[PDB]
From Swiss-Prot:
Predominant place of localization: membrane
Signal sequence coordinates: none
Protein name: Photosystem I reaction center subunit IV
Localization per Swiss-Prot or TrEMBL: Cellular thylakoid membrane
SS bonds (residue pairs): none
A single BP term in Gene Ontology: photosynthesis
Organism the protein comes from: Picosynechococcus sp. (strain ATCC 27264 / PCC 7002 / PR-6) (Agmenellum quadruplicatum)
Pfam family for this entry, one: PSI_PsaE
GO cellular component: photosystem I reaction center; plasma membrane-derived thylakoid membrane
Amino acid sequence: AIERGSKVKILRKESYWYGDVGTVASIDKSGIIYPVIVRFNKVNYNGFSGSAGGLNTNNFAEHELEVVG
C-alpha cells in the first residue's frame, strides 16, 4: 500500500535507519529504484562533506518499505 504519512518500517540492510520506522513523505513516479522518500526524526552531522548537513529523508523502494500502520 504505502500511504502518505503512514508508518513504514525500513527494511534496508545497509541503512542508518534499518529496523526503525520513518514517516512516509511522498512517492516519486519517476522509475528509479528508491522513489519513496521516507521521513526520520534522526539527523546526521558527522563528516558530511561541505554540502548541506543531515539527511532527514532517505530513499526506499515500495518492496523495501514495510507499511505496518
